[PDB]
């Protein structure tokens, strides 16, 4: 035989739209074609982020979009995730491209004079990506991450799944 | 020397280098072991290192030029045939009439039957 360090196993990268969503399947078809032909790292990035699981595509609120678009007035924020609404703070005028807009987030963005785009329109308008800002939400804000580990640990304790007689 | 029991080695002649490269030569292109078939693929893989033909490849290996490391690392390890390893057996040094160890220029007789 041959002395290989390890044998061939599937590479743990997703390369298609998870699930049976007909529209998300077409979006992966559109951007897998765009990245293969245009050879643009922007389409490669969007295609890769379209194939992540739901937990790995965290939301971005309108407050975060406003802060990141402050010094980018004439730009199109591109976040591959759902865009929620932060009712604590106002929404300025900006153009956002996202997979899905919350009913209140879409109204707030529109009522301020902005625009709510989808990814098909963005590819039609800015295929390689020229006036866009790539944005992703925070991953560590999940509450599940608090209980990972050993709660007896001296340095970074876990958070003790509550149960029988938890004080 | 540390791995002496598991290998036999020696000093090749120029004709030995040529036959190994021409018959058993290969390159690692895109992670694929593509056998040598034209100068275009050798130019594509090693054009940056000023090796644009197979005879540049042979000369660099034989004389150990400045870009030996890059050229040698692109060359896949040759897969040889079988041949009479030793007189007694391969459990003793070639000095004792065995199979492993440093054969010096006598390694070309073995390579002749294995290429």
């Amino acid at each position: 035989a041959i002395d290989l360090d390890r044998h061939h196993v599937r590479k743990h990268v997703s390369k298609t739209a998870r699930g049976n969503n007909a529209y998300m399947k077409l979006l992966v078809r559109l951007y897998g074609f765009l990245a293969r032909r245009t050879q643009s790292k922007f389409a490669k990035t969007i295609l890769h982020r379209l194939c992540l699981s739901r937990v790995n595509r965290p939301i971005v609120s309108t407050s975060k979009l406003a802060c990141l678009m402050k010094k980018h007035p004439e730009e199109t924020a591109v976040c591959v995730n759902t865009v929620t609404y932060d009712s604590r703070y106002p929404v300025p005028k900006m153009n956002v491209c996202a997979l899905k807009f919350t009913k209140t987030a879409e109204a707030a963005i529109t009522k301020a004079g902005g625009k709510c785009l989808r990814f098909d329109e963005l590819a039609l308008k800015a295929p390689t990506g020229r006036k866009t800002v790539l944005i992703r939400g925070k991953r560590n804000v999940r509450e599940a991450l608090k209980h990972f580990g050993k709660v007896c640990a001296k340095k970074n304790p876990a958070k003790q799944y509550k149960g029988k007689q938890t004080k | 020397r540390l791995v002496d029991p598991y290998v036999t080695y020696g000093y090749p002649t120029l004709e030995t280098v040529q036959k190994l490269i021409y018959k058993r030569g290969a390159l690692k292109i895109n992670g694929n072991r593509m056998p040598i078939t034209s100068n275009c693929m050798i130019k594509k893989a090693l054009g940056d290192k000023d090796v644009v033909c197979v005879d540049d490849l042979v000369h660099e290996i034989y004389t150990v030029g400045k870009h030996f490391k890059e050229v040698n690392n692109k060359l896949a390890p040759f897969k040889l045939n079988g041949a009479k390893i030793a007189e007694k057996n391969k459990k003793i040094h070639f000095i004792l009439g065995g199979g492993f160890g440093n054969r010096e220029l006598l390694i070309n007789k073995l390579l002749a039957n294995m290429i």
Binding site: - | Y22, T37, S38, N39, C53, V54, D55
Partner: protein, 97 residues
């Protein structure tokens, strides 16, 4: 396939042929010579065992010349023979320790 990989194969094959053709002819034009020197030392043998072979005093120069050379080259034959004798003595002393 060799031409495709090594276009220099045509230059070093025709030129290799001309080396081969002539080199073969040198064998022929050394056998014709070594036919004379081998048929001039027969008529120095069957002419020496025959009559003279006490009457052991046989002529010193029964061997006859077959290839003619100038006087300058004759001096070089004895110059060469002196050198090869020195080389044989040079080597024998060395390995004799």
């Amino acid at each position: 396939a060799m031409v495709k990989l090594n276009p220099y194969a045509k230059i070093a094959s025709h030129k290799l042929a001309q080396v081969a053709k002539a080199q073969a002819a040198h064998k022929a034009q050394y056998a014709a010579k070594m036919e004379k020197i081998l048929a001039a030392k027969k008529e120095a043998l069957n002419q020496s065992v025959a009559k003279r072979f006490i009457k052991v005093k046989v002529e010193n120069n029964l061997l006859k010349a077959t290839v003619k050379r100038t006087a300058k080259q004759d001096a070089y034959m004895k110059k060469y023979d002196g050198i090869v004798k020195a080389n044989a003595k040079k080597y024998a002393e060395k390995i004799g320790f």
